[PDB]
Amino acid sequence: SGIVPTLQNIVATVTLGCRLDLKTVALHARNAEYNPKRFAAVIMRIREPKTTALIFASGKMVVTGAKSEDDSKLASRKYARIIQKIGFAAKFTDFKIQNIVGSCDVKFPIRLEGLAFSHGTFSSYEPELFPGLIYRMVKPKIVLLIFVSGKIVLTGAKQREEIYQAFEAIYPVLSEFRKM
Amino acid sequence: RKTRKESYAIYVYKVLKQVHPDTGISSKAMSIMNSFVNDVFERIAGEASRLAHYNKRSTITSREIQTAVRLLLPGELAKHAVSEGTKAVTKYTSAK
Amino acid sequence: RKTRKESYAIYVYKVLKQVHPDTGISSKAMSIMNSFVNDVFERIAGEASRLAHYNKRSTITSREIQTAVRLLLPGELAKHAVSEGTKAVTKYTSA
Amino acid sequence: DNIQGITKPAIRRLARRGGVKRISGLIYEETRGVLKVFLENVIRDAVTYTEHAKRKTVTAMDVVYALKRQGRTLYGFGG
Amino acid sequence: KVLRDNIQGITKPAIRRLARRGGVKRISGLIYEETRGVLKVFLENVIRDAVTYTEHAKRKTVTAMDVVYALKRQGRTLYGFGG
Amino acid sequence: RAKAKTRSSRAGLQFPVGRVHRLLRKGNYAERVGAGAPVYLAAVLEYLTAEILELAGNAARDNKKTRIIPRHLQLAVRNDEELNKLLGRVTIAQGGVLPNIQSVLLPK
Amino acid sequence: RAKAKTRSSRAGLQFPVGRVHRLLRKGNYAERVGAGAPVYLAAVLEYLTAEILELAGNAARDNKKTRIIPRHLQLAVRNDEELNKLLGRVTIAQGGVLPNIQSVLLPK
Amino acid sequence: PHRYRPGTVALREIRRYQKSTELLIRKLPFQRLVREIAQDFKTDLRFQSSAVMALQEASEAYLVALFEDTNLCAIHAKRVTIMPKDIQLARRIRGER
Amino acid sequence: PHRYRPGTVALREIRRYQKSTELLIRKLPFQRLVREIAQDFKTDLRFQSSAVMALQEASEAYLVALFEDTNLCAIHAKRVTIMPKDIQLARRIRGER
DNA sequence: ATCAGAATCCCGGTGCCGAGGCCGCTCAATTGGTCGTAGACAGCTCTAGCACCGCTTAAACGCACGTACGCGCTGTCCCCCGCGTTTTAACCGCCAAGGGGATTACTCCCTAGTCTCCAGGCACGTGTCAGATATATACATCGAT
DNA sequence: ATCGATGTATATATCTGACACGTGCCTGGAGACTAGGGAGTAATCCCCTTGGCGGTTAAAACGCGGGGGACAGCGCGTACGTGCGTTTAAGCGGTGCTAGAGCTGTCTACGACCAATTGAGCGGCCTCGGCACCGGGATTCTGAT
């Protein structure tokens, strides 16, 4: 194709490795939420840059909502220094970028019915229970959601080259399955 | 010549003459009374069987019949039927 | 140890793993399946008892159970249940 | 077509015994269908009871047992 | 011990919730006392039968089985509590 | 061997306790049948028969008839409150219905 | 010397022909129980279990939950026509209802 | 001439047929209906007379009770005339449809 | 501000409570009602937890089926509101009165 | 109120057939004895139901307000009822036939009962994984805007 | 038209108690052999279902005027739905304890079984009186006035 898919959600996980308490993190931060019946962990949100915070008492840190991979690294660093200035010891090891989410538009509709009938083992479409079409090729572990409009969103990636190679790999079949 | 088919006809007639010594009863009404007695017998014996199976017992006693009567029949009817059954079982035990 | 209490769980479990070979089943749905099997057993055996007492027979044969199945179960369910039962009785008497 | 033999006066007589003052004109075909469904159920169970006894006549006791199976116990024809 | 004013513990929102499961779009105000009376009648029937089953067994605690038999006796067969 | 006093006379019943015992044993209701169970059951059957026959004789006298017909048994059953609950799912043949007309059908 | 063998295997069944036979004899259903009656009855119980569990597994797949809960059995029973006729006077606990709204309550 | 108001002789007929115990369907058309219905289930069937009579008493008791419930439906809808939708409501509330 | 029309949130509650399976009556007031009702029949009863759960499932299934029949009665009378006479008609046609 | 007029009810008479009573018979209940077993009672364990107490928070409750719906009224028209006339087919009675259901007698094979034996199924321990539930992205709907 | 708040259908994360499964045991189910009686089969008989003829009359079909009831439209007012602040009690999580469920052991009362007796109950026959139909008079509602 040629267009870079715009990265939307960069979900990563960093280990902290320490004994924490929930009331002190819930009270010594800003814009946090704790509902005990839903989770035994405190939820929080940071506006600059936007990333939803997910704090565990076992020394675990889950970042979501970063705009890029370097944004996720600096967000995990910010959360780490938040944990250091409240009074515990946070570190920056085992940076696991388990989810990379990117979106773009091909600007042309794609005929879902043709990809459902030609690739019935690869896809399945029903109009009232799932408007999106699922596609899974074999060289990455990847789930695809091509839409009627032609919207293409990728998720579950570890590096953005996977979304690039999978977009250039799915571009031929939607390129021979145009619609107006 | 034909099979001696069992029937409650003479007992319903005796009870009718006990409660109404001049009133009689038709044959179709006698068949309705016979099938009524058979139906209520099958209901009380079926629920007595259920009561014996629920409590893992093998004997239908008068307690099973009393509880099955208290289950089947509505309130004042069931209390008077329990009174009649208890009087008759005590009269049967007082005799040999 | 508590006294042995029989149940139909293992069988309903084997039927589930034949039919839907990957799904599980909750224990509440298990108790529902056990009480369903017991209820249909009581229904068919009660109609077989009535059929044996009506025709002055003292045995419960496969014919009494088959007629009780035709009386208790609704139409297409009764045809397929009669077919499965006859198939099983033939496979049992052949062995 | 003997289902029509359940005549409009007969359905009117049944409704008068049911305490019905005024009867619409579409009542009769639905009542004939309802009666045919009822008789189909009862006759199916009675013929099942007949075939089980290896008989070929439908006795009154088969109809009575078929009615008790539905829960419409009937007095006056044995039991 | 001693219990009273409990049929009104079957509250008006609870009756409205049961009607919403019944598919009822709009409820009169006189519904709730009628529904409380109906529920009281039903519970009296089932509980009277359950007590009779309990007594016949010479017990003093009403088991789940007793309720299930009391509902099967009334044609309200209930699956999921034993058999 | 003394004079064989009928069991029904002992219990003070008209209904046959021995026939009820034979039907309880041959009906496959349980493995065993206690001695007081047919006595209790025959007493209950006699009481219910006496109740229906009393009310049916009352209905036949109110209709100024001597014999009880199915119509009188039907009036007796459907006019009693508890007998209508006991025989709610029971059709009495040749019995007809209760003479009940709804109020909105009666005129000015 | 036929050390290991069962009746369900001979009848090609998973349901126990021995337990069903013991329950038929201990249930006081008749004086005697034929040899093919528990085989036929276990086959019928197996078929009805297979029908309900098949429809419940389809409901579970449609609802994307692998485990079978009471709600899936209730949806399977009330959505099948003939199983709803077999279990019309049966309450399945924790089952809920069918999502049915009448048309006159739905708006413009 | 002379003419009754519509519904007076009808109410008198209600009183007449609630006073009587006779069969309101005629015997032979009902017997033909029973045999026609039975024919599909099994060919070459006979019927005792008491069987046909029992079916008549059950069918008429069912239809009379259904017309009482239908009348309750019609009175409930501020009507006196029974419609087929009254029969459908009566059969749905009993649990037959 | 914001305001819904009367009846849209009602249908959303209909869809919610027909989609869900929980018990809609609260457990302790129902248990207190069960114990007061059982008090008349006999004294010093102890209720198993499962017994009260079974009574609650059966009672709510009974009330839900009665409200479905009540809704049929109300729609039959060209209404949307269920009246107590709808409950009385449903319970008489069922055979409870 | 009143009066003609259908329609139901009471009284009496004729008939008729089915309910009541009587008698022979036969088989099913009774009585007397024996024997196995089951359940009534005592006693021990230990489960789980009740009673209470404190905290939380979501549901219940009271109220304001608006509006949609139940209900009453009016007009219309349509379609069911009341009735007279024609038709038709159910009903009664009477007869013929035959067929199948009930009966009895003989047989044989199929199931209960008993003993042994072992291995399926149940209770229990345990491990792990379906469900739950928070966050982007995307989409029907609903009603004020 | 429009828009945004609200549910909804797929992506990952961890967490948890319930569900899957693995194990020991034991008691219930299976193999084997037996009698005996219940069921299968064959001939018979009779009764009761099927089928037909005939008439005849009471009931069903049909036509038609009209009246009254279903039904649509309309107005209104009020009762019920919706939303919001408050409070109340349900739910949950521990603590304690003890009634009573439940199981075990024993033994004796009690019910199955069996043979002989016999008398209650059933089948059959006969008769008479309760009931049903018919005719008439009297009363009871119905409807226009």
PDB file of C-alpha atoms in Angstrom, chain I residues 20-93:
ATOM      1  CA  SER I  20     -30.767 -11.759  33.280  1.00  0.00           C
ATOM      2  CA  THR I  21     -31.315 -14.717  35.609  1.00  0.00           C
ATOM      3  CA  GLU I  22     -30.947 -13.416  39.197  1.00  0.00           C
ATOM      4  CA  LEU I  23     -33.677 -13.521  41.824  1.00  0.00           C
ATOM      5  CA  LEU I  24     -35.663 -10.282  41.744  1.00  0.00           C
ATOM      6  CA  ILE I  25     -37.235 -10.493  45.207  1.00  0.00           C
ATOM      7  CA  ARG I  26     -34.726  -9.844  47.979  1.00  0.00           C
ATOM      8  CA  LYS I  27     -33.785 -12.868  50.037  1.00  0.00           C
ATOM      9  CA  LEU I  28     -34.314 -11.856  53.689  1.00  0.00           C
ATOM     10  CA  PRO I  29     -37.811 -10.272  53.381  1.00  0.00           C
ATOM     11  CA  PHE I  30     -38.917 -13.342  51.430  1.00  0.00           C
ATOM     12  CA  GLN I  31     -37.427 -15.603  54.101  1.00  0.00           C
ATOM     13  CA  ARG I  32     -39.211 -13.651  56.848  1.00  0.00           C
ATOM     14  CA  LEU I  33     -42.458 -13.974  54.879  1.00  0.00           C
ATOM     15  CA  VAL I  34     -41.883 -17.717  54.509  1.00  0.00           C
ATOM     16  CA  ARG I  35     -41.296 -18.147  58.244  1.00  0.00           C
ATOM     17  CA  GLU I  36     -44.394 -16.151  59.238  1.00  0.00           C
ATOM     18  CA  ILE I  37     -46.515 -18.155  56.803  1.00  0.00           C
ATOM     19  CA  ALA I  38     -45.065 -21.414  58.115  1.00  0.00           C
ATOM     20  CA  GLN I  39     -45.711 -20.275  61.703  1.00  0.00           C
ATOM     21  CA  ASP I  40     -49.451 -20.992  61.451  1.00  0.00           C
ATOM     22  CA  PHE I  41     -49.001 -24.554  60.166  1.00  0.00           C
ATOM     23  CA  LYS I  42     -46.508 -25.482  62.900  1.00  0.00           C
ATOM     24  CA  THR I  43     -44.141 -23.882  65.407  1.00  0.00           C
ATOM     25  CA  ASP I  44     -40.326 -24.018  65.837  1.00  0.00           C
ATOM     26  CA  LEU I  45     -39.643 -24.766  62.164  1.00  0.00           C
ATOM     27  CA  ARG I  46     -36.112 -24.373  60.864  1.00  0.00           C
ATOM     28  CA  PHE I  47     -35.724 -23.751  57.145  1.00  0.00           C
ATOM     29  CA  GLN I  48     -32.842 -25.112  55.106  1.00  0.00           C
ATOM     30  CA  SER I  49     -31.137 -22.485  52.959  1.00  0.00           C
ATOM     31  CA  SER I  50     -31.896 -24.507  49.828  1.00  0.00           C
ATOM     32  CA  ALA I  51     -35.565 -24.809  50.813  1.00  0.00           C
ATOM     33  CA  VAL I  52     -35.999 -21.034  50.948  1.00  0.00           C
ATOM     34  CA  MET I  53     -34.083 -20.762  47.671  1.00  0.00           C
ATOM     35  CA  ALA I  54     -36.445 -23.306  46.092  1.00  0.00           C
ATOM     36  CA  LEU I  55     -39.481 -21.446  47.413  1.00  0.00           C
ATOM     37  CA  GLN I  56     -38.102 -18.215  45.970  1.00  0.00           C
ATOM     38  CA  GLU I  57     -37.402 -19.700  42.520  1.00  0.00           C
ATOM     39  CA  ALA I  58     -40.847 -21.318  42.413  1.00  0.00           C
ATOM     40  CA  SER I  59     -42.640 -18.197  43.667  1.00  0.00           C
ATOM     41  CA  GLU I  60     -40.917 -15.880  41.210  1.00  0.00           C
ATOM     42  CA  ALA I  61     -41.538 -18.273  38.311  1.00  0.00           C
ATOM     43  CA  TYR I  62     -45.209 -18.406  39.334  1.00  0.00           C
ATOM     44  CA  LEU I  63     -45.428 -14.616  39.548  1.00  0.00           C
ATOM     45  CA  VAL I  64     -43.616 -14.120  36.228  1.00  0.00           C
ATOM     46  CA  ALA I  65     -45.939 -16.544  34.429  1.00  0.00           C
ATOM     47  CA  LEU I  66     -48.924 -14.876  36.080  1.00  0.00           C
ATOM     48  CA  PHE I  67     -47.695 -11.465  34.937  1.00  0.00           C
ATOM     49  CA  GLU I  68     -47.313 -12.796  31.395  1.00  0.00           C
ATOM     50  CA  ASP I  69     -50.923 -13.995  31.485  1.00  0.00           C
ATOM     51  CA  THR I  70     -51.920 -10.691  33.115  1.00  0.00           C
ATOM     52  CA  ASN I  71     -50.217  -8.830  30.268  1.00  0.00           C
ATOM     53  CA  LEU I  72     -52.169 -10.950  27.784  1.00  0.00           C
ATOM     54  CA  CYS I  73     -55.373  -9.997  29.636  1.00  0.00           C
ATOM     55  CA  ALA I  74     -54.491  -6.299  29.585  1.00  0.00           C
ATOM     56  CA  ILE I  75     -53.551  -6.295  25.897  1.00  0.00           C
ATOM     57  CA  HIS I  76     -56.794  -8.187  25.227  1.00  0.00           C
ATOM     58  CA  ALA I  77     -58.797  -5.305  26.734  1.00  0.00           C
ATOM     59  CA  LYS I  78     -57.002  -2.794  24.428  1.00  0.00           C
ATOM     60  CA  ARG I  79     -54.896  -1.617  27.375  1.00  0.00           C
ATOM     61  CA  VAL I  80     -51.202  -1.372  28.183  1.00  0.00           C
ATOM     62  CA  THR I  81     -51.692  -1.016  31.934  1.00  0.00           C
ATOM     63  CA  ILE I  82     -52.272  -4.222  33.878  1.00  0.00           C
ATOM     64  CA  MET I  83     -55.172  -3.966  36.334  1.00  0.00           C
ATOM     65  CA  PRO I  84     -56.043  -6.247  39.264  1.00  0.00           C
ATOM     66  CA  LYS I  85     -58.988  -7.517  37.216  1.00  0.00           C
ATOM     67  CA  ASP I  86     -56.425  -8.753  34.685  1.00  0.00           C
ATOM     68  CA  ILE I  87     -54.822 -10.840  37.444  1.00  0.00           C
ATOM     69  CA  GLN I  88     -58.270 -12.073  38.492  1.00  0.00           C
ATOM     70  CA  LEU I  89     -59.141 -13.073  34.918  1.00  0.00           C
ATOM     71  CA  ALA I  90     -55.805 -14.834  34.464  1.00  0.00           C
ATOM     72  CA  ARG I  91     -56.182 -16.720  37.735  1.00  0.00           C
ATOM     73  CA  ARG I  92     -59.763 -17.741  36.995  1.00  0.00           C
ATOM     74  CA  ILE I  93     -58.989 -18.989  33.482  1.00  0.00           C
TER      75      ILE I  93
END
